[PDB]
Amino acid sequence: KLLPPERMKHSIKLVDDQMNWCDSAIEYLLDQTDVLVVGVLGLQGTGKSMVMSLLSANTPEEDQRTYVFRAQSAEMKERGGNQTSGIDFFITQERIVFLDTQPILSPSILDHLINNYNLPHTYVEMQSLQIAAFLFTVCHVVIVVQDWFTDLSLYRFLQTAEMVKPSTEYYPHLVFLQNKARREDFCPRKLRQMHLMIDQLMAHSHLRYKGTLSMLQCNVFPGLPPDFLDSEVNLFLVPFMDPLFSLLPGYRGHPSFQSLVSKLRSQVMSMARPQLSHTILTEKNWFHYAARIWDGVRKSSALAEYSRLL
Amino acid sequence: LLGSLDPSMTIHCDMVITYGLDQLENCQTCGTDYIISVLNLLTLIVEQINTKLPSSFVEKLFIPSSKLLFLRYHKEKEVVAVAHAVYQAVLSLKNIPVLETAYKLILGEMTCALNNLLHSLQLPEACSEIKHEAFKNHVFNVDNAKFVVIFDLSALTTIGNAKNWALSPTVFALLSKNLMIVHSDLAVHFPAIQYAVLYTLYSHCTRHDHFISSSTVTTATKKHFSIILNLLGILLKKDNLNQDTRKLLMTWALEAAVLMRKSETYAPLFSLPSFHKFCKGLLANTLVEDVNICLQACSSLHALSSSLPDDLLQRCVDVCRVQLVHSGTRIRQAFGKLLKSIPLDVVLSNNNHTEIQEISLALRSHMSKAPSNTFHPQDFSDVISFILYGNSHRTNWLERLFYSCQRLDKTIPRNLLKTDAVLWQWAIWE
Amino acid sequence: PVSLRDLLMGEPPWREDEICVVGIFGKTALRLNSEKFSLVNTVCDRQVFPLFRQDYSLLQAYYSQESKVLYLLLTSICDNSQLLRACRALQSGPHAEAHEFWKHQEKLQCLSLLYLFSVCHILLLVHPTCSFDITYDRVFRALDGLRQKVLPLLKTAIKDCPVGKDWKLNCRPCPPRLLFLFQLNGALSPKRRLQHALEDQIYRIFRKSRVLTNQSINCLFTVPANQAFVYIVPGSQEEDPVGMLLDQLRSHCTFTLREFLWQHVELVLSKKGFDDSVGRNPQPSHFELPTYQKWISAASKLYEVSKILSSIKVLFLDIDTKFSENRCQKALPMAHSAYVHKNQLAQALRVYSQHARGPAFHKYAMQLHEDCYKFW
Ligand SMILES: Nc1ncnc2c1ncn2[C@@H]1O[C@H](COP(=O)(O)OP(=O)(O)OP(=O)(O)O)[C@@H](O)[C@H]1O
Ligand SMILES: [Mg+2]
């Protein structure tokens, strides 16, 4: 008489591709408290869907055709199109909510909207800003996935999104995930430059991008002392897919993909869960709060002010 | 035309040498094909003129002012390949007096690059016993120094992998005792140099059966196995090793262990102290987060199970006991077989187990801490359902639950998080 | 390989030779070997740039006699090499100073880009990933209008030049052709399909944003209508020399970019020019083939250039600054109508902070505090 409610096999659609709410996740929610919400953000081919799938209910040794979050297929890469649309939803058995996100400012959505405001160009930017603000106001942590280092345009977008957010202020933690890392990026000399650039580029961001999720203490660098870094921000690197002398494998210079994925998952799960509103909330209450926030963000006033400026 | 004949004459070499030098001195900003042609011509000239090349030819060929050193920086792989071929041809000479100067110049360049890296890392210089006057004052960038060191190490394989060269600094001693500073601090910021040094040393030692028969040439190599074992033990006992370096060291250790017992004539080699240090390193390198490393260590220990003292067997018993309960499957079977390979006179002994003591200490430390109040009702319901009814309703779930029950805003060792005993005790207490 | 400023000041061997100007620009990731240097070395087939070798903008020039072509490489804050130095300098030596610093850097980069867009024959944009950022569409939209406000001033300085007639009118030799270069970055014949899809997407996006028009005169740049203008550099072991050396050690212990560029260079070198107009009524496009001294005569005058700063200051962080200023101004009236006096001042400040915030809230907060203090 204490069996679990149900087990989710595949992620559902929390928000339709037309920016419409979809109330269909209450069937898998309970009345428990102390819930954790994780969101993702990134460009078109960064790999947010794969990261979310591997961090929620998947393993690297499994296949990409059975992932909880649909990933880009080989036939789709040749056409230069996107796969994830709208916002997804999935909750693991540990009562951890995972939220996916479509690419921001991606040319695929723009091209699809061409054959369908003053011009059909600021619409994509506003949709991206709306999603960023929503994830920044109803999620406990947000992970930013970057295909390459220093895009120089994501920081400005993040600051602008946080400046136009809906609303003793609450600022969720920010995580910088560098996907498809190489050996050259796994050196202390380059690490210092990376941390310095990240810290100097977000000096007045008001977000919690430091003091938590320190990969230096996760045994990634055995002999690297903590004082070697002026300010270790929350940055993590994810590498590319992976008689006796002649059988020695090649030298990669970076830890195994599975090891880093497991470490990242453990660190994400062992994170804090601060309060969102000025009251305690449960799973159902959190769902209702998120729905109300999305409804308010859609018919907001700051967005119109920013729209007349473009 | 030169290759048509054979190196068994006394043809005029001054004209050919001056022609090659003149073409090399003005081949910096040339095309991609002219450089390759010049390098090929130089290699052919060196090979054709054997034991007759004056020392001045190679003296002015391996100096900073020489353009050859600046031609290896090309992005094309063909240029680097021909440059390496030139180095191989020069180092493949049978004339000791003309080869000693080249070897000394190469060693001096390596020392200069190492000193530059040490200075840039805010550390004093070293390796002053192989320094050269030609590189007294020079500046090498971090990337340039690393590239030069790796290139020289790769070029040394010509003489290191020889099939039988009587030089003062032996290759084995140079890579095992002279370059001992790369494992102190350079192994943290520049692990590529350490990996390259270990790889070349392993490649040179594996071609001579790790110098087991010896333990002129035989008398000179009468103390090589002991040094290899000591180096392996010291390196394995460290705690600041990289994944690639650890994997290479484990492979080398496994190969050496399998070779120690191939014959029965190597029995006296089990009493020397280096063997004890090697065994200690193997025992201390297990019980890590990596699964493949643990499997390799277990296989190596199971290979030479016999010939070990009571202390090593006693420690192995505790290691097998703690590893018997693991979240994996291969680890459990491997350690089970290893334990079954130990006699009853040691498994049933009343000696104290260190691993069990550490587990108990960790549990006590966690219990003495203040309550966390993070155990959700669902976790308790699942635990109760699995204990009273047997159905857990959860598809390695203990580790996931433990990780989800922690907080970063507000300390069991990570290596002990893979054991089901600790996780079960923690869940029951929670 | 010398600086552009150090080249115009200073030729007899190639005083009059027909050449083509090729501009190189775009973003670059943090790596030892930059994409532009490798591109120049591969095209010239020689080690032009040797390996291991106030403002944050730079323009490098290099002449190739074997091919009679001039290359103009551009470096700005977009590249990681300059960004790292800027961050390091800013670390040692306020929310208002950083904004102004970034705005100045962006303005300088925009000015340099505009200068390159008027003295080059063919220009190419690089990128570290297959996907192209749509932000460029806005940058170009904010650049064309800028030249429209600077063109009358540029033609006044080059009036006494032997460039010709069309050059003095359009302030350019001929409509420059833009090329796009991307990198595989581990993605994925599929290459041909990907290139075609990218070209179609780029053409549609640029046409919708009105960046590209039927007339090849008003637009600042055009693209080929029947040839290829998008290239994807495949992965190779050239990068990270350490890895290549390790692979070599392990082994010992046990179209094309050139053609892609000549396809377009042969047209300008043959005086044929370019013709891209399918608006049902094409018109002739101006084109010229100057020499070394002839090109320098105008390049020096254009590089030496009173009113440029004033015109460039009217054009991006401008939107963010305007939004922040508007929000602060709107929030100030609410707090000004809310007010011993310490409690009232604290309440007003808290209300103002919770009402709105931006990048210039310090000025509004100070003004409100001063007004409240002076009202008692
Ligand atoms: N670290 C990685 N190493 C190798 N391949 C990867 C890696 N991450 C992602 N990929 C592959 O590259 C592509 C990235 O797309 P993916 O499905 O992961 O999500 P995405 O790029 O966020 O998608 P979307 O276009 O919806 O934003 C996929 O084909 C995936 O298999
Ligand atoms: Mg996706």
Author numbering:
A (entry chain C): 170 to 285, 293 to 343, 361 to 435, 452 to 519
B (entry chain A): 463 to 626, 632 to 682, 698 to 877, 881 to 895, 900 to 919
C (entry chain B): 4 to 13, 39 to 81, 133 to 172, 181 to 275, 295 to 360, 408 to 458, 476 to 485, 488 to 511, ...
Sentences copied from the publication:
To understand the molecular basis for the SMG1i mode of action, we reconstituted purified wild-type SMG1-8-9 with an excess of SMG1i and subjected the sample to single-particle cryo-EM analysis. The resulting reconstruction reached an overall resolution of 3.1 Å, and we observed clear density for the SMG1 inhibitor bound to the kinase active site. Superposition with our previously published AMPPNP- and substrate-bound model revealed that SMG1i exploits essentially the same binding site as the ATP analog. However, SMG1i wedges deeper in between the N- and C-lobe of the kinase domain and is engaged in more extensive interactions. While the lower resolution for this part of the map was not sufficient to unambiguously build an atomic model, this density clearly docks at the substrate-binding site of the kinase domain. Superposition with the previous cryo-EM structure of SMG1-8-9 complex bound to a UPF1 peptide revealed that the additional density in the current reconstruction is mutually exclusive with the position of a bound substrate. We concluded that the SMG1 insertion domain contains a PRD that can directly occupy and block the substrate-binding path in the kinase active site, analogous to other PIKKs. The SMG1 PRD would have to re-arrange upon substrate binding, as observed in the case of the inactive-to-active transition of DNA-PK.
The PI3K-related kinase (PIKK) SMG1 monitors the progression of metazoan nonsense-mediated mRNA decay (NMD) by phosphorylating the RNA helicase UPF1. SMG1 is a member of the phosphatidylinositol-3-kinase-related kinase (PIKK) family, which also includes the ATM, ATR, DNA-PKc, and mTOR kinases. These large, multidomain enzymes share an overall similar architecture: a C-terminal catalytic module (comprising the so-called FAT, kinase, and FATC domains) and an N-terminal α-solenoid (that typically serves as a protein-protein interaction module). SMG8 and SMG9 form an unusual G-domain heterodimer.
